[PDB]
Amino acid sequence: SWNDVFQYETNKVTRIQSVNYGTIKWILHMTVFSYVSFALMSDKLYQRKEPLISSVHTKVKGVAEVTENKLVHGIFDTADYTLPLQGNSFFVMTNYLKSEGQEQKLCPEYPSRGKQCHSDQGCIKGWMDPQSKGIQTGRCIPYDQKRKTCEIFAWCPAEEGKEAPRPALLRSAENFTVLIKNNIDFPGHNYTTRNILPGMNISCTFHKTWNPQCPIFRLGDIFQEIGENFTEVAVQGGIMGIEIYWDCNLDSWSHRCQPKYSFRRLDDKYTNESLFPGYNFRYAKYYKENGMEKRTLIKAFGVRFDILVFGTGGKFDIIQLVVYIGSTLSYFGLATVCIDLIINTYASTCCRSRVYPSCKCCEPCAVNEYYYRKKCEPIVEPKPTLKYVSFVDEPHIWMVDQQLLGKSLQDVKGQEVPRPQTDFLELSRLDSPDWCQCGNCLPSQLPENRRALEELCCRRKPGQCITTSELFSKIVLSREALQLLLLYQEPLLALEGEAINSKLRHCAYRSYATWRFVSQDMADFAILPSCCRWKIRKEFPKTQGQYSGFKYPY
Amino acid sequence: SWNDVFQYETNKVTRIQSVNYGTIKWILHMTVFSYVSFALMSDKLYQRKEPLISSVHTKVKGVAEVTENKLVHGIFDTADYTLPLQGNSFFVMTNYLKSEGQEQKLCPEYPSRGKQCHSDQGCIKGWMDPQSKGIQTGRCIPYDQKRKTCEIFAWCPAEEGKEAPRPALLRSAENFTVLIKNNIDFPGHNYTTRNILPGMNISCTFHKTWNPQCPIFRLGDIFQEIGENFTEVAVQGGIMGIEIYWDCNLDSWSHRCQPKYSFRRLDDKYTNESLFPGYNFRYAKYYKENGMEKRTLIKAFGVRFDILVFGTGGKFDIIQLVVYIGSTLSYFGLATVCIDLIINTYASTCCRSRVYPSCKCCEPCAVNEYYYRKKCEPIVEPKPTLKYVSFVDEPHIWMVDQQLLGKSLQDVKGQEVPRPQTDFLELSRLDSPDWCQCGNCLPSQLPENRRALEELCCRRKPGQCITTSELFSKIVLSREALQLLLLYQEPLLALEGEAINSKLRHCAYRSYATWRFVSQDMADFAILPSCCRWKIRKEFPKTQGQYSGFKYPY
Amino acid sequence: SWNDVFQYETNKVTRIQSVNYGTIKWILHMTVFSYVSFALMSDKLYQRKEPLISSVHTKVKGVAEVTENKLVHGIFDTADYTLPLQGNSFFVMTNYLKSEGQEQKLCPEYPSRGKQCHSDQGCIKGWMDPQSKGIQTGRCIPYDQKRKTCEIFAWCPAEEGKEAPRPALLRSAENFTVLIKNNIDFPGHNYTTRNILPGMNISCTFHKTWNPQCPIFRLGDIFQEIGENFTEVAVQGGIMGIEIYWDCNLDSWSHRCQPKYSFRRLDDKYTNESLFPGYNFRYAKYYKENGMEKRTLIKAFGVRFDILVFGTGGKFDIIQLVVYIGSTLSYFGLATVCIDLIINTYASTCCRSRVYPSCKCCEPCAVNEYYYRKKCEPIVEPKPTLKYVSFVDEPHIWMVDQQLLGKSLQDVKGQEVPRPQTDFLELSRLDSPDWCQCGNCLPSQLPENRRALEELCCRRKPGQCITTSELFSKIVLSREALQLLLLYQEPLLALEGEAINSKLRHCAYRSYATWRFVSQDMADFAILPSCCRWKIRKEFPKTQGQYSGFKYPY
């Protein structure tokens, strides 16, 4: 409880003194660090970004001389051509159609797009024409001497459908100027600025290169900066956007909050004639003449200038930086993942069999086998079916994970596992059964259902028994050695009774298993051959009992 | 320096050939990968998202026939009922109250909500009534034959408080159409589009299902799509929002930037009468009649249509993808964490004592003890108080981490630790003290303050001494074996002088400690019993000195 | 294939029972968890945040009494001083200059800022003055009896440049009220609310403390809340922002979506006179008098109130939470990184040599050497140049990684490595060459080009040969021991032919290498001295062949 809490687990590591792997690791670490730092700096991922709230105030300067037909020469000032800024847009009239002295009465509709009538059949009665802006009476009447148009109750004289005058009457509007004052705020960052600061000169007009910070814009300059023709757009009008981009850095050490001005036509050039190309609106001036209520309809074409203000303000935020660093921390395991993959791949035996002979250049990479055997310790799941057998004729060990369904273990033929290398430091001291192949194996006395477990020979092929080897007597059948091992485990062991024979048998089994399998993990589930088993059992006979044989440790 | 930099550390790993653990690991890896990929695809976390900047241009089409009372029949066209788009909203008049020929003079205020006066006391003088829109004079005068209302200096005839006409005069506005042109831009992504593209037909009107991309909307259709009644709203007016959502994907392979249109009433239906329900504004037309400056006040009720354009444009960004992948990489350790937790929990001994007998189904999970002992190597902090003792009668070892404050170590009673399994591969070769329990322990010759350190018996309970065992003489008291060990450590060691006895004593102590504790970590802080210690010391007596005893290695 | 997929790799770990390290680990884990949770809660990083779409509807209440000079006393109601909300801003007239009965004709320009003319030279002809708002004719004419100003074709009488009246005519506008209704929506979250809900009283007016949720604002209160003087601003006008911040939490358990009102002047106080200080616009009322088309120009100064609505709505999103948790997961490795760094640093030998004597307080930290030797297993890259040598006179081993370019290995002098501690548990059993220093080394029989490999002596300095040690005969030259090892490796080995001598030689080399280097990794690339090599080779002579010597295992 108390002790379990006060524990620290650290990973066991193998440190490789390799030039190539160290170089690869450092190259990858530096690459990851460089990319992560570059991304952090470029995208300012350490900054919290706040959108701006903007207020725009515009002022148009300019007077237009207009001459029309008696001959009437007049001047238009801001009140005569400008619609005050509403929201973030201002309108400049560039052309107009005037219809003076309109009365609500009957009149022929203007002949637009060949809207001629030859009979009263074509003209419906009671039909509200949104183009003509009147109610048809069902009659066709002469609009002039030659052509006739459907009659309508409307504001008369009706002139809707008349084309915009060409050239535009207020062409001189290209020479008008607009002063744009832009106040922006980031309330989360509690910062505010404006596009005009002390030091600027009113004698400036905006230029992309010479005066990119002057907020005074000539309208024609706006149009010609983005390849638009003010003279043409003036006839039918349009919508132009003045984009103000605020890429603002609010850190004291990198403070930069300046506006960037740009221009973009917002109305489609090739809008279909049916979809009301350009920009215009109809303005009515109502008055009384004699006893008649009249109105002067001005179809004003012009350019609506939409001032579009957008941008973000970035300020250092520790939480954003921490989240980014945490997001990128796992990328620093790239070197370990790559080098471990290299070690795993170049540890395979196949590489030596096929790859290396074909490509002798990659021969020095065989050292990865040593790294893998120093890094990885394979272990198999211990289950009752797990058995290990060893044949003296063969050089390797065999692992059997399959149940013995009556077939002798000698024939059940599991997979092959290598015998571990023995600790040389520790070794610096001094009617036979059909499945048998050595003439010493005896039939098992276990129950038939599990008799195949012990049906194992010391060798696969005929030959001399392992029991005949000199080492077998000393390692296994030497009573002195087994007694010494017993004393080592139990110094005060009493060498009396029938248990001493059982203990010697167990230690002899363990000794053979350790000798022929080395690994304790394999020795624990090893299976002794019948010959060696029975030689051990007769060296230490059991008096009045039946041998139980191998049992599952778990 | 140079070599230390060229190093790679790799973790030591134990590979388990387990079907269940491999299956669990792969299931968890696939689950994590699937969720991470699904989140990335669904939220487009590989995309950087930019808000759009929008421009809206509206055009209302329609004519309304209005008949009022002589009987006056007229028609309203766009100039008579429409307020041009300003910002992103347009207004359509649906009802109106007209007050013609107003003069700044004295008049009785309109009797609204029973605003009657019976005496001059109720009518204050100089009071500016924002409802009546005039200055009270303090007098109560007859507004008509029967009822009287307070006098005010105001625009007269004053009609403020008159209810909106019912039914609405411009009901036919439900049949008006609005064409909405929406230009949107993502400047960061340098992309722009509009809601009208070549191919569309003007003969379309919007429908949620049939024509969801037609930008021509009948106002009544707008109202009835969201269960609003245009006829009723027309009387007092309201505010309707046309929402244009641009969920735009700007990747070439998944390009989809189309508008979705929706409608939402923006004015509260149940606004209190005191809070100005609906939508109206007062418009003044000033003129001169005779020598008098007059004005026609139109209280125009109608629907303000707010065009609300919102959305984001997503474009693939490598940094966003990298940050997301880094954020999600640590989730791939889930399999390892879960399997390690399983191994730790099922390695506990308790599971066998209580859990397994109750639930025999979870018995095969005992293999986790083997995995844990193959994965974890416990070690304790080496401190001067750390001691290990072993009693031949007992089967385990005892660890004492507490200072001996004069109490004999035999009685100080630390915790219990298991004795490690000996390497069987290496073992394949050939007036007694009160605290004593074997009759061979002698009083310690160390200073009293630290005499309790050596006050240890080979056993807890009375019995035969471990020294009497045969193995004790060979392992510990055999001069030949100790000399051989000395030669192994120091091949050219000179067996002369008084140092040879000290070296043999040290090696005998080490041999006993290794034999009775196995582990070198426990043997280093082991404590020899007094009996064995003094038997060793008399086998190799010290000539002219005092034994120093156990010392702290660190 | 099938088996390789069903594998789980778990890291080998050493568990340290340390109070300090466990405490540090838990402190760091708790610190990381606390900061991560605090950041998640404070920034709502579990929430997805959506910007709001807003609609604003304003209503101004108030009447202003204005007296001017005959003496004219009038009242202004909303239609006389208010511009209806367009976009999200409303204008209140606070001052005005009136120019009645303007005709397009010739007139002298108003004498503003001393715009006097003394000769026709100063007055250009055809010059469009945007300040005077007329076309100069090139003549200088008397504007009055004393001063003269340039003639212009313009709307006359021209009064542009006249200063705003002081005090402001519509001062009483400070007492006007505005009701602001704000509808906001988060469409992604499908949530909508408004700033007015049932329960509020119309008899409220906004106050920062008493009535912070009342949407009725007195204009003078707006100005005086942020230290602005309405009386002064009324003369020339200005722009004020009413900021409505919606910090909205849309989770059911933490639902809070309320508006916060604030005020900010948006027009620069100290705008240069040339940059049009304040806020005004010119409004033209056109009419016909007699047979002349005239206009009344009102330069209306006032306050434009910009209603600025901003905010975000946060709603729990599982993906955002998952991404944040993944981003922060890697920070939980801080404890491991720090403790491992501590172990690595305090494991260095230098600490004992210099740091500990200077600062004895940090002496108990020497236990980190044990932790490091229990955590890390150094291994070097096995390459053909890798050799290990051991000198009996010296106590350590020497590693040589450099090619022998004809120089004897005895003199090539590589680095020093410690000899590993032998397993005491396993040890519990029973004309001389110029480079030589023992009198037993013989010249190598290998080819000259690689003769320096075997040119190694058992010791660096003159002395007795290691071969003379008793252990050398038993470990190396004992035929019985080598035969026993052969049987252990190959139980049925046939001790016949010339191969038995070669096998005994190989095992003798291995035995010496294991004895003098312990570690199998160092023993594999160890180099035997010439004396021991040739003693072994003469104990087991080769009959009719040439010894091949050491070979690279890989």
Ligand SMILES: O=C(NCC1(N2CCN(c3ccccc3)CC2)CCOCC1)c1cccnc1Sc1ccccc1
């Ligand atoms: O009437 C004419 N121009 C005024 C316009 N608006 C009217 C509405 N104002 C306004 C201002 C503030 C708030 C609300 C509203 C702004 C200005 C017409 C609509 O489009 C922009 C200009 C106009 C057109 C074409 C030929 N003539 C004349 S009048 C004239 C007569 C004689 C000589 C010169 C001009």
Ligand SMILES: O=C(NCC1(N2CCN(c3ccccc3)CC2)CCOCC1)c1cccnc1Sc1ccccc1
């Ligand atoms: O005056 C009337 N309607 C015009 C309205 N606005 C005026 C201002 N215009 C405008 C345009 C551009 C820039 C700046 C301003 C837009 C249009 C009145 C305000 O609300 C919307 C319509 C009106 C109402 C009710 C009965 N009659 C009549 S006039 C009439 C007379 C005889 C026959 C029919 C209509």
Ligand SMILES: O=C(NCC1(N2CCN(c3ccccc3)CC2)CCOCC1)c1cccnc1Sc1ccccc1
């Ligand atoms: O004309 C005067 N005030 C009306 C203002 N606007 C006009 C345009 N309307 C409007 C409404 C809806 C849509 C489109 C447009 C709003 C109101 C003038 C521009 O600035 C705001 C007020 C004005 C000024 C200064 C002295 N007098 C008088 S008229 C008057 C005459 C006698 C007595 C009192 C006032």
Ligand SMILES: Nc1nc2c(ncn2[C@@H]2O[C@H](COP(=O)(O)OP(=O)(O)O)[C@@H](O)[C@H]2O)c(=O)[nH]1
């Ligand atoms: N590894 C291994 N152990 C065995 C084998 N046969 C018996 N044993 C061990 O010996 C013990 C059984 O004792 P045994 O000598 O067969 O007869 P017993 O006196 O009736 O118990 C068990 O604990 C087994 O682990 C074998 O073939 N291989």
Ligand SMILES: Nc1nc2c(ncn2[C@@H]2O[C@H](COP(=O)(O)OP(=O)(O)O)[C@@H](O)[C@H]2O)c(=O)[nH]1
């Ligand atoms: N593990 C262990 N080592 C001991 C013990 N007693 C003595 N030693 C070791 O023996 C050395 C002291 O020598 P010692 O034989 O007691 O007498 P000395 O000749 O005066 O040094 C120290 O290095 C101890 O590590 C013991 O009880 N346990």
Ligand SMILES: Nc1nc2c(ncn2[C@@H]2O[C@H](COP(=O)(O)OP(=O)(O)O)[C@@H](O)[C@H]2O)c(=O)[nH]1
């Ligand atoms: N570690 C080590 N191994 C050696 C050395 N000399 C020979 N060997 C081993 O002995 C084998 C060569 O056999 P050797 O006795 O020299 O003569 P051979 O009969 O011709 O092969 C090789 O596999 C070497 O690994 C040495 O100096 N050090």
Ligand SMILES: *[C@@H]1O[C@H](CO)[C@@H](O)[C@H](O)[C@H]1NC(C)=O
């Ligand atoms: C703009 O000004 C220049 C220089 O005064 C003049 O040449 C040009 O004609 C003007 N443009 C128009 C459309 O009047």
Ligand SMILES: *[C@@H]1O[C@H](CO)[C@@H](O)[C@H](O)[C@H]1NC(C)=O
């Ligand atoms: C602009 O359009 C006008 C037509 O109004 C044309 O006369 C002129 O040549 C055009 N200018 C350019 C640069 O294309």
Ligand SMILES: *[C@@H]1O[C@H](CO)[C@@H](O)[C@H](O)[C@H]1NC(C)=O
């Ligand atoms: C709308 O149009 C239909 C069909 O022309 C007509 O029946 C209906 O009366 C109209 N609505 C109004 C309010 O006039």
Ligand SMILES: *[C@@H]1O[C@H](CO)[C@@H](O)[C@H](O)[C@H]1NC(C)=O
């Ligand atoms: C809409 O309101 C009008 C009242 O102006 C009513 O006559 C009509 O029945 C209503 N329509 C519906 C569908 O509720």
Ligand SMILES: *[C@@H]1O[C@H](CO)[C@@H](O)[C@H](O)[C@H]1NC(C)=O
């Ligand atoms: C505002 O109202 C108060 C109280 O009615 C009055 O004293 C003050 O003069 C008013 N302000 C103006 C500018 O008329």
Ligand SMILES: *[C@@H]1O[C@H](CO)[C@@H](O)[C@H](O)[C@H]1NC(C)=O
């Ligand atoms: C506000 O300005 C006026 C000038 O119009 C001045 O008389 C008054 O004292 C000022 N008020 C304050 C509080 O400064």
Ligand code: NA
């Ligand atoms: Na991570």
Ligand SMILES: [Zn+2]
């Ligand atoms: Zn056999």
Ligand SMILES: [Zn+2]
């Ligand atoms: Zn056999």
Ligand SMILES: [Zn+2]
């Ligand atoms: Zn005793």
